[PDB]
């Protein structure tokens, strides 16, 4: 092998000596393969979404999904290039995730937002606080990365959140 | 005149014999008929729908409208390239078409979505079953554009089925 | 008056010896102008709210709607504006008399429902369309054909906006008790 | 109403508490109010500004309120998202501004930069100060944000002062 | 010669008679010949403006003088399709021309735009009074046409006409 | 029935009364779509790895060119699966399913070097193209000509991809022992 | 030599032996030899057409060359995909094309059209007879991009049909 | 006045004395009629042409009408940078070119282009004496722009040579 | 027969006498072969090569092919309009050219490129004789012409000398 | 003079005082120097890299190049905003850096590129202690300018610790 | 010889064999070239300078008029450096020996005005100007006509500059002392 899952080996070009790097790599390893597994699902949940909004949501879960694949594009690099290897397959992303997934059956749009919403939602706080942790390291090219994978996520977060807001143009005289 | 509806030629320069074109020409005569008429349809809903979804729809029935118009375009130059004279008046469209056609009123969206969708279905077996008979008689430029035809519509009739689903965001508390 | 601390003062209207308009017939169209950007960068105030807060099933589709009102609104008060100041006036510029002299009504600081929101936007799309054909017809008949032509040109967009929101409204969706 | 006026609520989809958002909130709120002033001043300066680099300037102001109203675009959007409700009448913006504006009278040119340098150099000193409590309360996205914005409202900022220095190609022989 | 200089046939396609075509055709011929005279002051000013501010003078005035030659192409154009001759030649041009045109001496920049905004203050004029015998001849789309040159030709002349207002950054302690 | 709380089972398949396809005959296309899907997304998902980490004398033209290589599979998979769903079936989504019903060969999570993680590359591609292959057949035979023409466009791609891996490993090059 | 000319290895990364890929090279290798003679003799029209309708066909001409040589390329990388030589010199080309080529002398217009012609008509009838070798094979992606070559080559040979049929707008009175 | 018609200064920013430059200016001047003319009435062409290849004519003319403006322009532009005074009126091109110009006239497409290629014939062989001329004089920049210059004029006179040509598609039949 | 290969009738349009044009185009025309078997030469490589570098040399010789394929282009369009005839058929470019082409074998890549360099360096000392002989001629449309291929031509062979170098990343340990 | 070198007056428009603005002027100024060495060392890289994997390299360097010079546009700019004097010659530059610079001599690509990588790590541990330099004079437009120029260059370095790794597609075979 | 560590030495020429282009020829060019890209980045280097400090009231035209001359700057350095490497020659590359081998005036670190700034700029276009003119018959004389016809290229550029500064520093403007 050239390298071993696991290593970590930091970089001379980027002069981070392997112990400060290992600390990145680990959090973004772990946001690595979370947010894998949100692609996946945003990609699911574009691929089935059904009914009366549902080409503005498959419009937007493909967006999303293509957002989250840069950001995990964005990570896995990094830890690359901070002598780590990132989490590649698919049964190891999903193993190293935290987040919760759904089985393969198909739920109802309100369903399957409200659980891409709580994924979201566990990427941004851990987000958060690796971005901190980058910074308390000294490594502000992690942690502006971070920021701007972040802000890319909570917008995405934050759009699902008014998907499933409590209004409607709909009236039952419509009905 | 130059040549008299519903004569077929061949055509020299693709070297096919106006027995094998005529075969070809007569499919792909009543396809553009039909192809017309959902064009024409689709605009009318496009020009007409109301509510709450109305703007995706708007922009998605103006779309589908130009994809049939394209395929429509397709169909009669390659009728006219095999020695055929496509159907072209608006009249005479209707009169060849085989799918049926709303009447001058405008029906609520479902129900206009549902007539589409009726449409779509024709044209999409038709297709299928003209796409074999060009690669049976050899024509297998035709039979290659039926199917990059086929596949923009089978999208387009797939995009209705889905917007007619029982399924949506809205919820009685919303109401 | 070669003492004033103004270039200009705020209501005067010099017409323009580049565009040969006196200042009379520009005063007329400098006052229907300056009437019509008050309202429509009011206008574009609340599309901007209602674009930031639209919430629910469809909101998407309306933030982009409404976002793409506003810049379209923006860009008729921009051409009004201009035409204001190249007329000789001065355009209604903070937002305190932006607000002061439009006569349309604003949306107090809450946030309604997309209905509510969407119906009070349609209320000022109409005062502003019925105004602007007074104020196309007003400048024709000063034969000031530029701003004619101009008005008209906005005229369409906001018309158009305007209908899209009636659509919104209207008591159609393909949504079924079914999927309910 | 479906939201009152200075209530925040947070944000369930970015986990964050209405306690925190409602501090980022405030800052907000009092930074959009400012920088629609701003905007509605440099376009007031991009209409009127007259002499010999008169299109020069209009150019640059226009594509400063650009700017202007993009930043007033993303601090209103972020005000939503965690809760709020960002201030939008246009004398709800003037009352909450705590910068100077300009009566309804024309200066001249150096006086009117004069003017916008002063609301610039008091957002900027404000956009600091927020940055920095968004970073304290781990706001990471509130303050990679506001940093965004900063770096191009310096940048005009910078702009104007330049125009306004003591320099220029035109020499008394010219006259 | 296939048609000769002063002619006019109307127009079988666009159903304008010869008397009705004509009265539009001599008020279009007119425009054209100022409108040409216009566009060569503009390109020698374009050409030889120099000092502080010529550059942005120099592509302002170059664009000007592109309005000018396609308001000049769609008059001339709108001649021909009425069935008229447009004037061609630059003497002819410069002879059925109603505005001065300065000598070939070159004027310093304030005297030069003096002259063009002279030439245009005339040519909107003028086409104010032809956009009004279009409308009532019922020829709306020529009316139309003028229309949209004009707002183009009057933010030109508004343009000129601010850069010779009195204003500037400039101060005395600058020099 | 009319109380389960999934709108669709995994492994059902509906067939489409919108393409005029029965769930008999939808069911032979979804079952090889979805094999295919899965191997595909395994593709897309070792071809980002070796993007990620390939290293040495040509690693920039191949990261870009493994980056392209993703992409490409990447759609195919998205077309693949929206096929599936079209014709009311349920395409796998998870990355352990896509894994799990994978009949290719994945790596390990170490890394190897270049020569080693491409031609396990172009074993996974043979295998896709193989199975591609049969699949137009099927889609052909079945008169669904819309999958048919579908998995061939797709099948061109990979196919280029596959054809570009073989001569990165082809034995010839321009470095000669004197340049060492 | 790396390979010989003639020979054919198949791909192990296509999973196409070689047995399976000679025959389609055979086909494709033909077909090269006879596009690109087309090629080389619609640049030579391209080049030489002059007369009323030339600039038309000048344009039409380069860019059925262009659509030539971009079959041609495709071919030829199918073949050395396939493990094969495409045929690459002029005079190799030129030895393996069936299809009739000019002399170097240059004919008018409607004979080195009707000489376009019958190469495009002998290009087709090959290439549907290839299409369905490479099917029957199983070689589907052979069998795709050759229909996609065919389609654009049909449209070329249609267009040159129609540049040579019975029709004009000009008239005895005309001339 | 700040330039005198005749004068030429030289530039010191070239290094280019007024001798030296003169000569270039003179010729530069030259051409710079013969092109404006030749601008005029390949507009007037432009938009007198009829019949039964006019389209493609007005576009090919209106090409090569701006053809001769962008020479024009770069012409005048090197005369002014040369310390020159570019011809700038019409009355003045027209008087200071040595072509022939037709009269208000319109003629047949055929005579019309005659005139035109005699323009042409007549600006190309002075160009290429000025391009010697510049060379000898050491100006490179002069002769590299006339000789960019040229090829595009080169070109537009054989379209015109060639749309002159005695073939065409059309034939007796189709008449 | 409209013309006949190796004529030379000048052109009128370009006030090129056929004894001053002969002598170009025999120039060019020898020229033309050259580059066409260049071009064949460079999709040869193209086509074939495999290898540790050969994406990036695909990518290359392609570009080199389109660069040489629009020099042959100008080349055999400036034949034409001085009044030749382009040498067109494959054939016959090959038994024209003079540079040397490769047998049907495929030779690896070092040999490749160093037998295009040997063609590059005998078609770019050829051209730089013909510029001068344009030149001379007063051609210098032509010469112009001849000298932007030249430098398309000489960048290509430098980036081949460069492939060709006695370096690389490569070592032993990476073996 | 306007200004003298090494003087710090801080900004007005940005309200930053010269004590503040002097801190991060001086770090500026540092990095700009080093930068531009960057700059200049890797387009000598770039103007000469041959051998094997040269086109790629050249590119990539040449891209490289281009990212420095924009981070160093950046930091001279925000260090005239500052009131700060950029150095600005090229003997001052080279002067004021730290980093080591190759002598005039041409040396292998590895050799060329690990001194590049060697200038890159000390900027990027530069950059990072200015980001934080920035960050706590409270200076935020400045610390996000400088990490977003971090995390490029931080690509670049990462990039040539890629190319000099000791993998490769070469055998011993293929040599 | 075989031994040295340095690919090549700084000063030696080389010629092509892929260009024909012996190294008796190419030095001569080499030299000329060599010359010129010197003093076009040290034109580079203060055109920087002049676009970063401009302040006042043409500032912001000044600045991209002197953001795209340092870019135009740039390029010719570009292709002047890669045609001396082309030839065999080695392009002069660090900041110091750019500024050593370069014969024009350069700025000391003060900041001057406006006025003073372009005016020493004016000065290194002219130079430039004339040696360019002067190496483009050097190269037409060597048959080199690849060389000369860049070298017209890069001169029609730098003339284009060199006139505009000259035009912004003419003795015009609109300003009045009315204005004043
Ligand atoms: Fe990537
Ligand atoms: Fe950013
Ligand atoms: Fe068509
Ligand atoms: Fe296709
Ligand atoms: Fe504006
Ligand atoms: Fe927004
Ligand atoms: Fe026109
Ligand atoms: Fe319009
Ligand atoms: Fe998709
Ligand atoms: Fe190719
Ligand atoms: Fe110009
Ligand atoms: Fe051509
Ligand atoms: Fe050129
Ligand atoms: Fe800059
Ligand atoms: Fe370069
Ligand atoms: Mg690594
Ligand atoms: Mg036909
Ligand atoms: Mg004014
Ligand atoms: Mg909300
Ligand atoms: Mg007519
Ligand atoms: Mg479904
Ligand atoms: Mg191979
Ligand atoms: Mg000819
Ligand atoms: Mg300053
Ligand atoms: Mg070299
Ligand atoms: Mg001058
Ligand atoms: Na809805
Ligand atoms: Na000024
Ligand atoms: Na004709
Ligand atoms: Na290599």
């Not at 967006?63 to 690359?80: G, H, K, N, P, W």
């Not at 939602?121 to 090219?141: C, F, P, S, Y």
């Given at each position: 092998?050239?390298?071993?899952?696991?290593?970590?080996?930091?970089?001379?070009?980027?002069?981070?000596?392997?112990?400060?790097?290992?600390?990145?790599?680990?959090?973004?390893?772990?946001?690595?393969?979370?947010?894998?597994?949100?692609?996946?699902?945003?990609?699911?949940?574009?691929?089935?979404?059904?009914?009366?909004?549902?080409?503005?949501?498959?419009?937007?879960?493909?967006?999303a999904?293509?957002t989250?694949?840069?950001?995990?594009?964005?990570?896995?690099?990094?830890?690359?290039?901070?002598?780590?290897?990132?989490?590649?397959?698919?049964?190891?992303?999903?193993?190293?995730?935290?987040?919760?997934?759904?089985?393969?059956?198909?739920?109802?749009?309100?369903?399957?937002?409200?659980?891409?919403?709580?994924?979201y939602?566990?990427?941004?706080?851990?987000?958060?606080?690796?971005?901190?942790?980058?910074?308390?390291?000294?490594?502000?090219?992690?942690?502006?990365?971070?920021?701007?994978?972040?802000?890319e996520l909570?917008d995405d977060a934050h759009h699902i959140?008014?998907?499933?807001?409590?209004?409607?143009?709909?009236?039952?005289?419509?009905?």
């Amino acid at each position: 092998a050239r390298a071993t899952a696991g290593e970590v080996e930091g970089s001379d070009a980027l002069r981070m000596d392997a112990d400060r790097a290992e600390q990145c790599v680990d959090a973004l390893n772990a946001d690595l393969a979370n947010v894998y597994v949100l692609y996946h699902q945003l990609k699911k949940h574009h691929w089935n979404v059904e009914g009366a909004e549902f080409r503005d949501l498959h419009l937007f879960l493909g967006e999303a999904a293509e957002t989250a694949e840069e950001v995990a594009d964005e990570l896995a690099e990094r830890v690359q290039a901070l002598g780590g290897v990132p989490h590649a397959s698919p049964e190891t992303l999903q193993a190293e995730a935290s987040v919760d997934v759904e089985d393969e059956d198909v739920y109802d749009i309100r369903t399957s937002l409200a659980n891409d919403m709580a994924i979201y939602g566990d990427i941004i706080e851990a987000t958060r606080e690796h971005t901190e942790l980058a910074e308390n390291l000294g490594d502000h090219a992690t942690a502006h990365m971070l920021r701007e994978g972040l802000i890319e996520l909570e917008d995405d977060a934050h759009h699902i959140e008014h998907y499933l807001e409590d209004d409607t143009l709909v009236t039952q005289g419509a009905l």
